[PDB]
């Protein structure tokens, strides 16, 4: 079923900050804001951790959209191939979540990759989830109206304990 990362990295404080640093032309800014919150809260309701939003500067979890090279070892690659990627908890790049601007993203009302789904998967990595062998899990390694699976909940609660 679920996996963690080696040595179980996790956030150490009861509060974790996050910032949406850059946006996508595909959606209003407020729509991205509301979906990110919804994704975070899917995981947060299960565990003793609370998320605080910031609008400037560096936050623990930096979230954004980018084209091409964007300052880490994993540059984006144009339309297709890689869609998005995220990092396990830690300082600096740890926790951050990046989305390729050269895809099409949707809130559900148009063509595109469903952003809510994608953000819930990526932010699972940002909280310390690896990939699951269970096909029903949000953390299954491939993209394929939803909820966390029982395997997703068991894994996140193994790492943080229960709310």
């Amino acid at each position: 079923g679920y996996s963690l990362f080696p040595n179980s990295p996790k956030w150490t404080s009861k509060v974790v900050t996050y910032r949406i640093v850059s946006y996508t032309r595909d959606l209003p800014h407020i729509t991205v804001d509301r979906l990110v919150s919804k994704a975070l809260n899917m995981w947060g309701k299960e565990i003793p951790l609370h998320f605080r939003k910031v609008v400037w500067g560096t936050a623990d979890i930096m979230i954004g959209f980018a084209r091409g090279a964007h300052g880490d070892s994993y540059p984006f690659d144009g339309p297709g191939n890689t869609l998005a990627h995220a990092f396990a908890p830690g300082t600096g790049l740890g926790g951050d979540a990046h989305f390729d601007e050269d895809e099409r993203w949707t809130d559900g009302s148009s063509l595109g990759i469903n952003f809510l789904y994608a953000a819930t998967h990526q932010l699972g990595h940002s909280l310390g989830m690896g990939h699951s062998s269970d096909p029903n899990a949000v953390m299954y390694p491939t993209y394929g109206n939803f909820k966390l699976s029982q395997d997703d909940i068991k894994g996140i609660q193994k790492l943080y304990g229960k709310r």
Partner: peptide, 5 residues
């Protein structure tokens, strides 16, 4: 993609 660092 989930990377360590």
């Amino acid at each position: 993609x989930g990377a360590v660092x």
